[PDB]
Amino acid sequence: DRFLPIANVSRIMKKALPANAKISKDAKETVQECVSEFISFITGEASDKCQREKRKTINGDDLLWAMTTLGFEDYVEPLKVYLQKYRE
């Protein structure tokens, strides 16, 4: 629907956890909804920057700009690396 598939989210949560660990269904549902709000959140600020700048396509630099201003700077440098190894 309006969420990323819970099975992808589950797969990623496990990677952050030990083998011993198990995850509740409602914990998967919560993370799923947070993941979606994160997209809406970042997209919101980036979209705002584009309308201020008279442009109408959101690009990667917009998204990266939004993460830096919203406190997610830790993601920016690995994301840049990832962009280019993908060949941008």
Partner 1 sequence: QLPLARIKKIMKADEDVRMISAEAPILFAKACELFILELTIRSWLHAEENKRRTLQKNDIAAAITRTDIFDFLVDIVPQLSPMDREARVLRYREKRKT
Partner 2 sequence: HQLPLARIKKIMKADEDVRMISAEAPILFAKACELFILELTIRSWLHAEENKRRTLQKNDIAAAITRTDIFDFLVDIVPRVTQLSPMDREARVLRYREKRKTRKFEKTIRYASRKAYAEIRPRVNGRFAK
Residue numbers at the binding site for partner 2 (CB under 8 A)? 1-5, 8-9, 11-13, 15-18, 20-24, 26-27, 29-31, 33-45, 47-48, 51, 56-60, 62-65, 67-75, 78-79, 82-83, 86-87
6 contact, one of DNA, partner 1, partner 2, none, CB 5-8 Å limit per kind = DNA
Hey, what's the torsion of the CAs at 58, 64, 67, 72, to 10 degrees? 160
Instruction: Give 58-64's long-range contacts (Cβ < 8 A, gap of 24+).
Output: 60/88
Given partner 2, partner 1, DNA, none, residue 65, with its beta carbon under 5 to 8 Å by kind, binds partner 2
Question: Hey, which residues between 33 and 72 contact partner 1 (CB under 8 A)?
Answer: 33-45, 47-48, 50-51, 56-60, 62-64, 67-72
- ∠ CA 84-10-28, nearest 5°, is 125
The number of beta carbons lying within 10 Å of the beta carbon of residue 21 is 9
